[PDB]
């Protein structure tokens, strides 16, 4: 759920420097917790 997309906001000019910030608001929500699962403690020594 997105309150606003990834946006750019301009900041104040206190001198010969240009400033701005990038912001994003949101949260992930899953409605059915029992329709997901996970595997834990998996071993895979492919790096070496």
């Amino acid at each position: 759920k997105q309150l606003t997309p990834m946006m750019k906001m301009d900041l104040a000019t206190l001198g010969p420097v240009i400033r701005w910030m990038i912001l994003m608001y949101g949260v992930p929500v899953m409605y059915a917790p029992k329709k997901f699962m996970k595997y834990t403690n998996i071993k895979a020594d492919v790096p070496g």
């Binding site: 997105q2 309150l3 606003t4 997309p5 990834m6 946006m7």
Partner: protein, 48 residues
């Protein structure tokens, strides 16, 4: 006609079907999402 079946079931005042039809008529647009029409958010398009 002595052999014609007379209609019945007229003794149940405030029938459930009548209540459902009344709800459908007197309360239209129920359960619709109108939140978008009072949003002061300039961005109305959802992007990743």
């Amino acid at each position: 006609d002595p052999n014609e079946e007379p209609p019945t079931g007229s003794g149940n005042g405030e029938t459930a079907s009548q209540v459902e039809l009344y709800i459908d008529l007197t309360k239209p647009l129920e359960g619709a999402d109108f939140r978008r029409y009072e949003s002061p958010n300039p961005s109305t398009i959802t992007l990743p």
